[PDB]
Amino acid sequence: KRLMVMAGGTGGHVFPGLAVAHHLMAQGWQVRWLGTADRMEADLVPKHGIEIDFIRISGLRGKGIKALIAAPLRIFNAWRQARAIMKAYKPDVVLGMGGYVSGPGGLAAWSLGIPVVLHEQNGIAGLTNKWLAKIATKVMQAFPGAFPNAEVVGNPVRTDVLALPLPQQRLAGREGPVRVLVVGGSQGARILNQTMPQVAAKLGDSVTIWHQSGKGSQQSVEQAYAEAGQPQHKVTEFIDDMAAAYAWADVVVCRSGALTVSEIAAAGLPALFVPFQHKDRQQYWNALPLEKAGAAKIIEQPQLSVDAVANTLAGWSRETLLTMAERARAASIPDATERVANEVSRVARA
Amino acid sequence: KRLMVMAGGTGGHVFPGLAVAHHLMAQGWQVRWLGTADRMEADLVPKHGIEIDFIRISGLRGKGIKALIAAPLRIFNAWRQARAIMKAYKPDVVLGMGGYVSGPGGLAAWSLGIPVVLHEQNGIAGLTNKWLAKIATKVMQAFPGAFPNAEVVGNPVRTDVLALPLPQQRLAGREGPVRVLVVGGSQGARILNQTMPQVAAKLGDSVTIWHQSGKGSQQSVEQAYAEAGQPQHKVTEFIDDMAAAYAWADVVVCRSGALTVSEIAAAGLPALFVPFQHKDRQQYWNALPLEKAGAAKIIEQPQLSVDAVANTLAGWSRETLLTMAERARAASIPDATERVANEVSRVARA
Ligand SMILES: CC(=O)N[C@H]1[C@@H](OP(=O)(O)OP(=O)(O)OC[C@H]2O[C@@H](n3ccc(=O)[nH]c3=O)[C@H](O)[C@@H]2O)O[C@H](CO)[C@@H](O)[C@@H]1O
Ligand SMILES: CC(=O)N[C@H]1[C@@H](OP(=O)(O)OP(=O)(O)OC[C@H]2O[C@@H](n3ccc(=O)[nH]c3=O)[C@H](O)[C@@H]2O)O[C@H](CO)[C@@H](O)[C@@H]1O
């Protein structure tokens, strides 16, 4: 049994993919990757012991479907190239995780009669996934609403976060300033870098903060905190030991990218989500479940202010937090990785 | 508003299409037809006062499923024209009846985001419809079992048959010899042309027969009736007024072609179905619904014998016959043309 994972461009699509792959390789599967050379998967996949065939999707990047409907020809090359790869690798099934490289590969798998399985990581169906679903054999999504009748299996979660102790054990008799973790996605978010320091001035000693500013802002965010009179807080450009940071925290203030959301849930951590501002409210839809489950609270730009932030924090006792942490863990889907690996296997057995 | 109807070259595909097209044109809709120039529709549709655009689908007819998986480019030009024409006409929705053309035009309408509506005439789907049914917005079938669970709508039935009185009105009160109508599709069936004469020799004066022999076999069958010593029976090559014959019959012995079945059901007639012997067993499936309701009885060629027919006929009393007629009608879908037309309209509005 052979499999070809189709994902690239961002870690949002690549990491959940590598996770499902390694999982099936341990089951004896032969996995091969379909990506693009000028992008992230080019260097990452190899370091995972998975071969990767490349194709070029030049004038295919940033296409709004009306551009594809308007001009099909553009996808014809990649389609051709993909059919070639699968002509040679004879995959039993293909797994699309989203991203531009997923369009050609999906169409190709489908034209050859090879079953195509799809995983959507966000609350709002992305680029190719929206139109690629049409020719899919099975669709799965992380949270509800991306697609009408699609199974909710959640996002595969990084191992180090899955090994975190449950809330109870973690918050067992904790005392002192609420440990506040601030995270702005892998890049960092200006909004948090400029808001949290002022929130520190208002809460003062009621909290101890660990602030992740993103590359090139550590010095900036640090100085802001000092000028607010709270020099003791810790600022980091990028936290490598994300899991330990999660385990240390009482609560988290952060953007709501899909994986971060899933991780917080699996980690059982109270959250105050500050969704990225966009007409699609993707980030907003990624956090809804944890909120609707009563484990967090969302604040879009409309209601985002220094006070609303400090206000929301001052009201969560360690009692509430402990309650929110369990609601988060209960609302999580830790075994997402196998849930997808199994559906793929399931379709494999025609 | 504007609709593109796609029907191959064959009565089963065009007549149902024509019916629906006429129904919509009477409701304002503008209709365009897509077919071939070397097939039946390249003469009939124009006569029904409808515009028809042709497309070369030569290197497409004959080749099967795996034949297309191997040579995807074969349907390229067809798609070229199919799509091209739909840009110059701009359909709001397309209806595929089943013919070859059905494919190219469907792929085109699909690649243009134009909704696709499909209708299957037989209990078992043809080539094009089988696959074309994956990129369809709505799927309909005359009989159950041609597709997973498409909405059963039946087949459009010729007006002159619909205009018939109900079974009760014309069957109760009849006395004397049972009227047997022997029909063998629009071409006549050799097997019935040989069996019936013997059946008559065995049934004698208990029945009066009207036998439709198909073109070029009138004298042959007549002579055969002469042998049995039953010269009185009527033998016709092709009954022009099928309605009068149906209304006359007390029972029918015939083939199970899709349209003929819908006619028998709407007319409310008891039947002895002798499916066209074939590997796909298409005609067998077309007849099953009537048997399941006990409105008819089936006998495939393999089990077909002079005596099975005679005994079967001998066992049907004048009273039970009127019950079968009642359930035949009760199991018919008189308003197919309207259901399909409505679905087409329903979809179009979006
Ligand atoms: C452009 C934008 O608005 N953001 C998008 C971006 O989020 P973004 O990529 O910025 O955040 P994601 O959820 O994607 O990824 C975060 C990942 O980085 C890790 N991490 C983060 C910070 C840190 O200091 N250390 C660390 O290890 C987290 O554990 C997690 O694994 O991609 C997501 C899809 O995946 C989308 O849902 C977001 O909408
Ligand atoms: C050419 C050929 O070999 N088969 C054709 C034949 O199959 P076939 O004969 O099997 O078609 P069907 O049984 O589905 O339809 C029969 C139709 O012919 C009418 N009828 C039949 C006998 C008669 O004497 N008078 C009469 O008017 C019936 O009322 C009915 O409307 O018709 C189909 C529908 O047109 C075509 O798709 C097929 O290509």
Curated annotation (Swiss-Prot), chains A, B:
Biological processes annotated in GO: carbohydrate metabolic process; cell division; cell wall organization; lipid glycosylation; peptidoglycan biosynthetic process; regulation of cell shape
Impact upon substituting residue 263 to D: 1.4-fold decrease in kcat
Loss of function: phenotype: Inactivation of the gene rapidly inhibits peptidoglycan synthesis in exponentially growing cells.
Gene Ontology cellular component terms for the protein in this record: plasma membrane
Cell compartments where the protein resides: Cell inner membrane
Matching InterPro entries: GlcNAc_MurG, Glyco_trans_28_C, GlycoTrans_28_N
Reactions catalysed according to its record: di-trans,octa-cis-undecaprenyl diphospho-N-acetyl-alpha-D-muramoyl-L-alanyl-D-glutamyl-meso-2,6-diaminopimeloyl-D-alanyl-D-alanine + UDP-N-acetyl-alpha-D-glucosamine = di-trans,octa-cis-undecaprenyl diphospho-[N-acetyl-alpha-D-glucosaminyl-(1->4)]-N-acetyl-alpha-D-muramoyl-L-alanyl-D-glutamyl-meso-2,6-diaminopimeloyl-D-alanyl-D-alanine + UDP + H(+)
Entry keywords, A to Z: Cell cycle, Cell division, Cell inner membrane, Cell membrane, Cell shape, Cell wall biogenesis/degradation, Glycosyltransferase, Membrane, Peptidoglycan synthesis, Transferase
Listed EC numbers: 2.4.1.227
Effect caused by changing residue 10 to A: 387-fold decrease in kcat
Result, substituting residue 13 to A: Almost loss of activity
Principal subcellular localization: membrane
Effect of residue 186 to A: 40-fold decrease in kcat
SUPFAM superfamilies the record matches: UDP-Glycosyltransferase/glycogen phosphorylase
Keyword Endoplasmic reticulum: no
UniProt membrane topology term: Peripheral membrane protein
Pathway: Cell wall biogenesis; peptidoglycan biosynthesis
Domain of life: Bacteria
Family stated for the protein in its record: Belongs to the glycosyltransferase 28 family. MurG subfamily.
Role: Cell wall formation. Catalyzes the transfer of a GlcNAc subunit on undecaprenyl-pyrophosphoryl-MurNAc-pentapeptide (lipid intermediate I) to form undecaprenyl-pyrophosphoryl-MurNAc-(pentapeptide)GlcNAc (lipid intermediate II). Strongly prefers UDP to CDP, GDP, ADP and TDP.
Oligomer status and interactors: Homodimer. Associates with MreB and MraY.
Protein name: UDP-N-acetylglucosamine--N-acetylmuramyl-(pentapeptide) pyrophosphoryl-undecaprenol N-acetylglucosamine transferase
Species in which this protein is naturally found: Escherichia coli (strain K12)
